[PDB]
Structures are given as C-alpha cells and as structure tokens.
Amino acid sequence: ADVSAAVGATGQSGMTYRLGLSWDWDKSWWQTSTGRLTGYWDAGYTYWEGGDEGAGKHSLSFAPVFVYEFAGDSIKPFIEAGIGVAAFSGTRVGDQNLGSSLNFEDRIGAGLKFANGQSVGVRAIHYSNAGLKQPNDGIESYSLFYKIPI
Ligand SMILES: [Ca+2]
Known part of the structure; x- marks a missing residue:
C-alpha cells in the first residue's frame, strides 16, 4: 500500500487538499519493451476550500485506476485514468x-x-x-x- 498527499486547485481557483491510500493490483497486461498496462485501487479523502456556495467540505472517494507505465529503471514515466465514486459532505462545494x-x-x-x-x-x-x-x-x-x- 502507498500513501499519497496532493495539493491542488479547482476550476474556480479554490484550494483542494487530498490524502490517499493506494493498493497496487499486481497484475499487468500488454507488457512489451515499451511498458505495460497495470493499475491500482485508490481511496481518497479530500478537503475542498469553501467558496460562494459552501464553506469547506470533504469528500471520500474510491476508484480503480488504470496505469500505463513506460519502461525505466530509477525513473518510470506513467500515465493514468480511472473512474470511481465519491460522497461529499454536502451538495454545495466551493x-x-x-x-x-x-x-x-x-x-x-x-x-x-x-x-x-x-x-x-x-x-x-x-x-x-x-x-x-x-x-x-x-x-x-x-x-x-x-x-x-x-
Ligand atoms: Ca464520466
């Protein structure tokens, strides 16, 4: 398992802060000299700075995330995409x-x-x-x- 921290901003320029846990699938597909397809399960807890609709709010989310990881040694570039589900602490956020x-x-x-x-x-x-x-x-x-x- 991997823990993650992320700072970011919304389209409306409010701050978001996310703490996460990830579990590698430990399965790969399409493995070639180029890289491989793989993925992880991603759990996220996010705080969203308030804006004109809500004060600060929190979301809990969970997603399968696919990863294409390119070959490398001390550095492997990767791209990822996933779809999941999220529950917010209110209906107005930022x-x-x-x-x-x-x-x-x-x-x-x-x-x-x-x-x-x-x-x-x-x-x-x-x-x-x-x-x-x-x-x-x-x-x-x-x-x-x-x-x-x-
Ligand atoms: Ca969609």
Missing part, C-alpha cells in the same frame, strides 16, 4: 452546487515513478452526477501529488 452528495469521479494523471517506489505527478479529477440530480454543476481538482510506499 462555488458549485453539485445537486447530490453522491457523484462519479473521473480522473487522468501523469508522473514519474522512482526506483524506491515513490512517485510524483499531476492529476486532473472531475466530479459530477451525469445529470441525475440538477443543477449538477460538477467540480474539478487539478493537483500535484506525492506518493510513498508504506
């Missing part, structure tokens, strides 16, 4: 009226994985309810993350 507490989490990311198992990268994550509860404003977090094996 400047946004999400409509519902429950939301999907769609994410992409890229970074570097080091030989000691640590990694650093950027992530863009979006949360919305697919129109299932109006006004579904959605909200996003664009972040830098650091992860360390535990």
Whole structure:
C-alpha cells in the first residue's frame, strides 16, 4: 500500500487538499519493451476550500485506476485514468452546487515513478452526477501529488 498527499486547485481557483491510500493490483497486461498496462485501487479523502456556495467540505472517494507505465529503471514515466465514486459532505462545494452528495469521479494523471517506489505527478479529477440530480454543476481538482510506499 502507498500513501499519497496532493495539493491542488479547482476550476474556480479554490484550494483542494487530498490524502490517499493506494493498493497496487499486481497484475499487468500488454507488457512489451515499451511498458505495460497495470493499475491500482485508490481511496481518497479530500478537503475542498469553501467558496460562494459552501464553506469547506470533504469528500471520500474510491476508484480503480488504470496505469500505463513506460519502461525505466530509477525513473518510470506513467500515465493514468480511472473512474470511481465519491460522497461529499454536502451538495454545495466551493462555488458549485453539485445537486447530490453522491457523484462519479473521473480522473487522468501523469508522473514519474522512482526506483524506491515513490512517485510524483499531476492529476486532473472531475466530479459530477451525469445529470441525475440538477443543477449538477460538477467540480474539478487539478493537483500535484506525492506518493510513498508504506
Ligand atoms: Ca464520466
């Protein structure tokens, strides 16, 4: 398992702070000299700075995250994408009226994985309810993350 910390900002320039735990799948596919497809289960706890709709709010999220990890030694570049689910502590977060507490989490990311198992990268994550509860404003977090094996 790996713990991660991430600081970021929303599309409305409010801060987000995320603490996470990750569990490597320990399965790979499409392995070639180029790299391999793999992934991890990702659990996230996020604090969202208040804005004009809510004071500060919290979300708990969980996602399978696919990773393509390119070949390397002390540094392996990677890209990632996943879809998960999130529950917010209210329906208004930052400047946004999400409509519902429950939301999907769609994410992409890229970074570097080091030989000691640590990694650093950027992530863009979006949360919305697919129109299932109006006004579904959605909200996003664009972040830098650091992860360390535990
Ligand atoms: Ca989606």
